[PDB]
Ligand binder design. Structure first.
Ligand SMILES: Nc1ncnc2c1ncn2[C@@H]1O[C@H](CSCC[C@H](N)C(=O)O)[C@@H](O)[C@H]1O
Ligand SMILES: [Zn+2]
Ligand SMILES: [Zn+2]
Ligand SMILES: [Zn+2]
Ligand SMILES: [Zn+2]
Length: 467
DNA sequence: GGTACTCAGCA
DNA sequence: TGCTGAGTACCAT
């Protein structure tokens, strides 16, 4: 039960709940979401921990305070300092309680100084959560300050998490784990506002990844200009400047061979403008009585379902309709880069919230009887999609045994499952310049004694065999 | 058992 | 540049 994976699954559950709280129109669905993580005893580390957390590495990117609570990394949704209560005294007799374990520098306290390798961190108290957000009374050595003090005195390190601001439309604020720091020293003094503040000077420990500061182009756009956002391709692995789009034509829509059937068009729903009441929508009744997508960040798929029934050609609703999510244009600035032994593979340059549709696997719908590398069989196999010579960028996405994408079948133009639409959604929250991948799901010893293909996932859980 | 405290996150 | 938010952490006015 590998740590990074337990972490991944925890976060995915939190995201499920989150989205179901945003759909249910509740207030603070992040908070609500972690409340529902507590209801279900589904918080990865429920007791507190001095040091690193398995599966959470130096560099880890949390997308909200709520995530950090949902995993148990930082159990306060508000507090800068998370520490051990006196409830830990018999467990840790050798130390004196309370004891800081995780702090967050968000830039909310005026007397903070962030110099990266070293930090002068102001304790809590006398702060104004509203208004100017500034010190309004004197700080004492009474809580986080006391615990931080005890950290200094007993040589206990603290995890440090920084809040960063983003350009990425959908993500406004990210939180990065930058490692264990040590309280070098501490002292009381007046602050910028004239009120006594306590200051803690932490120095970053060693034996952890460095703290970095946050072309080889072969084609401007692998899309012909067809995509809403261009997809740039770069090789830096060679100056052998072949393009990914050689001998291949980019298409935005599906192509059907004459051998292949065109199913009867779905009847659709009659609501106008946008499907909101699910009483009145047939497309909602098709989905179990409740829409599968939520109206957040341009539509996010709540959770995987066998098939998803979208609004089709005949529905009275327009293209913005939240039940037409995977129909909309490319949200994300992507890139097709040359990998060292995966061939080409793709990655994002901006943040992809979990549940956002990345893209639909587009090619030529051929009959499975009629059939090298680039073929997606449709099971939800009578029919398949051959992206061999023509298709979109979906054919450049690699396999991983630890994917950040998953396969959802979507039905919109017809109600025939065999010709369902293969759409790939984000299973996790994805960060820029990191590789997008899904699981091909090949059963072993399938292709022919035998024959197999080595795997270059990089995943600690690689099976080492694609097939 | 009750409540003060708190470096978010909203439009 | 409003203002709610929920789960401690500690104590029982
Ligand atoms: N996890 C993986 N390990 C090794 N090779 C992979 C892989 N996933 C995909 N590939 C290679 O690439 C094919 C996927 S289609 C996209 C990759 C392709 N080489 C390209 O960049 O154009 C696979 O059939 C496989 O041969
Ligand atoms: Zn409708
Ligand atoms: Zn609709
Ligand atoms: Zn409809
Ligand atoms: Zn693998």
């Amino acid at each position: 039960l590998e740590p990074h994976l337990k972490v991944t699954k925890c976060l995915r559950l939190f995201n499920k709940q989150y989205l179901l709280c945003v759909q249910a129109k509740l207030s603070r669905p992040d908070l609500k979401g972690v409340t529902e993580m507590i209801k279900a005893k589904a918080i990865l580390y429920p007791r507190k921990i001095i040091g690193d957390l398995p599966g959470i590495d130096v560099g880890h990117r949390f997308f909200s305070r709520a995530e950090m609570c949902a995993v148990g990394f930082h159990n306060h949704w508000l507090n800068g300092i998370d520490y051990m209560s006196m409830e830990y005294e018999k467990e840790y007799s050798n130390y004196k309680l309370p004891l800081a374990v995780s702090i967050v520098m968000s830039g909310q306290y005026e007397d903070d100084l962030d110099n990266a390798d070293t930090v002068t961190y102001t304790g809590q108290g006398g702060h104004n959560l509203t208004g100017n957000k500034r010190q309004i009374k004197d700080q004492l050595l009474e809580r986080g300050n006391l615990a931080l003090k005890h950290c200094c005195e007993y040589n206990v390190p603290v995890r440090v998490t920084r809040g960063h601001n983003c350009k990425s439309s959908y993500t406004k604020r990210v939180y990065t784990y930058d490692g264990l720091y040590k309280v070098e020293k501490f002292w009381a003094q007046k602050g910028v506002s004239g009120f006594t503040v306590y200051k803690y000077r932490l120095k970053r420990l060693e034996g952890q990844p460095e703290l970095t500061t946050d072309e080889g182009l072969v084609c401007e756009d692998i899309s012909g200009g067809l995509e809403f956002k261009g997809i740039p391709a770069t090789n830096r692995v060679d100056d052998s400047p072949v393009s990914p789009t050689s001998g291949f034509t980019y298409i935005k829509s599906l192509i059907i061979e004459p051998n292949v059937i065109i199913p009867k068009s779905s009847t659709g729903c009659n609501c106008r403008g946008s499907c909101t009441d699910s009483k009145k929508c047939a497309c909602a009744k098709l989905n179990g009585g409740n829409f599968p997508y939520v109206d957040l960040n341009d539509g996010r798929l709540i959770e995987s379902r066998d098939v998803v029934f979208e609004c089709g050609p005949h529905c009275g609703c327009g293209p913005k309709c939240v039940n037409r999510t995977s129909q909309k244009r490319l949200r994300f600035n992507l890139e097709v880069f040359r990998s060292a032994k995966k061939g080409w593979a793709v990655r994002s340059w901006e943040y992809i919230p979990a549940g956002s549709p990345v893209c639909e696997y587009i090619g030529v719908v051929r009959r499975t009887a009629d059939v090298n590398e680039y073929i997606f069989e449709i099971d939800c196999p009578e029919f398949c999609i051959d992206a061999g010579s023509t298709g979109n960028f979906a054919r450049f996405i690699n396999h991983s045994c630890e994917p950040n994408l998953f396969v959802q079948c979507v039905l919109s133009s017809h109600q025939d499952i065999r010709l369902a639409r293969v759409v790939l959604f984000a299973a996790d929250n994805i960060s820029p310049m990191q590789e997008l991948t899904y699981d091909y799901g090949y059963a072993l010893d399938s292709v022919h004694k035998v024959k197999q293909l080595a795997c270059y996932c990089g995943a600690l859980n690689c099976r080492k065999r694609l097939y």
